[PDB]
Ligand binder design. Structure first.
Ligand code: HEM
Ligand SMILES: CC(C)=CCC[C@@H](C)[C@H]1CC[C@@]2(C=O)C3=C(CC[C@]12C)[C@@]1(C)CC[C@H](O)C(C)(C)[C@@H]1CC3
Length: 446
């Protein structure tokens, strides 16, 4: 009822902080935290935004019911142009919850066991074109490759065979629609995400009419994923339209690719920058898999603990998801403040995960930080790259399978280096932080 969180003055009448935030969001929220503490509001584009920084505040959002802090109210703008109607934030949460469970069917030890071989092969195949040595763009490569690995692993061999590396460029433009601008403005501007949704939709639509050409009198007794969707029905019983199916396959692919490819690229540069550490990851491959480095198996992954912490530290310093957003529909209180209905409520993993008074040597890439007590273990919500509560990621496990496998394979192929000391800066083009000038030097390993 009572007290609003501290408000941050802007001299710009309706825009508010839209420009400064859009240009440098992290810097902004860090500065805001030092001056206003962990809970504050500011205006952007005639709207009020309340951020919850650090673990104790962020808990309000993470522990929230969707009825009170609503996701789709914010997210539908961003994702409905990308996935299309009928799926995700374009439907009630009870429906989206049903879809979420369909997609979880593919995600268990059974499938992961097969995934590891697919991924290792796709990777090795892909990086032939790099030959023995050079200087190349590793982010473009992983973007291409992970289209292939993700579609193969999650979507099946059939779908995979109709996709190729040109589809990465569709997906860059899909992900291009996850921008400050798209977040805050009505969709009438130079977003070509719509063209790429037209294409990615068509591409995925051929595939239904392919299984459906057989679906008539050919009932598949080969286990697939598109099959699961076509075969499945909602709680109430109704079957998914060809449109629902299609959207969910676009989303599943983006899910497997967008967050993984930026993360994978960053790890590259962190390891290229710290050579001692890259060495040990290589040695770990041998210690764990044997000096003769045979093909990778799912069961080897759980023991690649250093690489595991390298992924963890990358997601700490460069999470692919910088902020999560909800719309307050009912008043809410945190830290002695009341957030009224209408506030957009936000948390930032990026910020939480380098908080000046939580994370010692906050900006250092040190994966050994997890071998002593640290906020990821000793706080509930200081480390949240995959989120928490009712909205959290179903795909963390697959994600780690893909990135470990790709980077296990890649360390076996090459030794990586920076080019004249240059460590990529952050590119805030989109709300998925990619690295600047992501060209890595590489030569043959061993
Ligand atoms: C590094 C890889 C990934 C990261 C960092 C990541 C991160 C996240 C985060 C932070 C959320 C929370 C959204 C929110 O609270 O508003 C989320 C939700 C989700 N992610 Fe991911 N994700 C990744 C990979 C994947 C993969 C591979 C899949 C599917 C196979 C996937 C599917 C989902 C789904 C279905 C949700 C649920 C959204 C909701 O319930 O509102 N993600 N992810
Ligand atoms: C159901 C199918 C159609 C899509 C399922 C995946 C979808 C729920 C996941 C995948 C992409 C995803 C998570 O990584 C993303 C977000 C939350 C949930 C999403 C849409 C969101 C929307 C969370 C908010 C972030 O700021 C940002 C806009 C970058 C991402 C975009 C990607």
């Amino acid at each position: 009822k009572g007290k609003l969180p501290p408000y941050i003055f802007s001299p710009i009448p309706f825009l508010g902080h839209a420009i400064a935030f859009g240009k440098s969001p992290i810097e902004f929220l860090e500065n805001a935290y030092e001056k206003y503490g962990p809970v504050f509001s500011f205006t952007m584009v005639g709207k009020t935004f309340t951020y919850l920084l650090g673990s104790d505040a962020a808990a309000l959002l993470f522990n929230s019911k969707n009825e009170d802090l609503n996701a789709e109210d914010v997210y539908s703008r961003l994702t409905t142009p990308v996935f299309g109607k009928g799926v995700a934030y374009d439907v009630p949460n009870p429906v989206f919850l049903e879809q979420k469970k369909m997609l979880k069917s593919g995600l268990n030890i059974a499938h992961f066991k097969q995934h590891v071989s697919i991924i290792e092969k796709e990777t090795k195949e892909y990086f032939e074109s790099w030959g023995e040595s050079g200087e190349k763009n590793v982010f473009e490569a992983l973007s291409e490759l992970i289209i292939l690995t993700a579609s193969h692993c999650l979507h099946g061999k059939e779908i995979r065979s109709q996709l190729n590396e040109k589809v990465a460029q569709l997906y860059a433009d899909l992900a291009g629609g996850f921008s400050h601008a798209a977040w805050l403005l009505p969709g009438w501007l130079p977003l070509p995400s719509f063209r790429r949704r037209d294409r990615a939709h068509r591409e995925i639509k051929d595939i239904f009419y392919k299984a459906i050409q057989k679906r008539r009198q050919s009932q598949e007794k080969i286990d697939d994923i598109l099959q699961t969707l076509l075969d499945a029905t909602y709680k109430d019983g109704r079957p998914l339209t060809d449109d629902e199916v299609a959207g969910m396959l676009i989303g599943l692919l983006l899910a497997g690719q967008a967050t993984s490819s930026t993360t994978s690229a960053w790890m590259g540069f962190f390891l290229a920058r710290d050579k001692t550490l890259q060495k040990k990851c290589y040695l770990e491959q041998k210690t764990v898999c044997g000096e003769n480095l045979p093909p990778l198996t799912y069961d080897q992954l759980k023991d690649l603990n250093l690489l595991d912490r390298c992924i963890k530290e990358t997601l700490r310093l460069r999470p692919p998801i910088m902020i999560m957003m909800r719309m307050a529909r009912t008043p809410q209180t945190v830290a002695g403040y009341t957030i009224p209905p209408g506030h957009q409520v936000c948390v930032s993993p990026t910020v939480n995960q380098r908080l000046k008074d939580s994370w010692v040597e906050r900006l250092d890439f040190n994966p050994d930080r997890y071998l002593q007590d640290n906020p990821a273990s000793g706080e509930k919500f200081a480390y949240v790259p995959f989120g928490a509560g009712r909205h959290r990621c179903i795909g963390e496990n697959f994600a780690y399978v893909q990135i470990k496998t790709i980077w296990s394979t890649m360390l076996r192929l090459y030794e990586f280096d920076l080019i004249d000391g240059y460590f990529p800066t952050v590119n805030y083009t989109t709300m998925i932080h990619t690295p600047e000038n992501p060209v890595i030097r590489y030569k043959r390993r061993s």
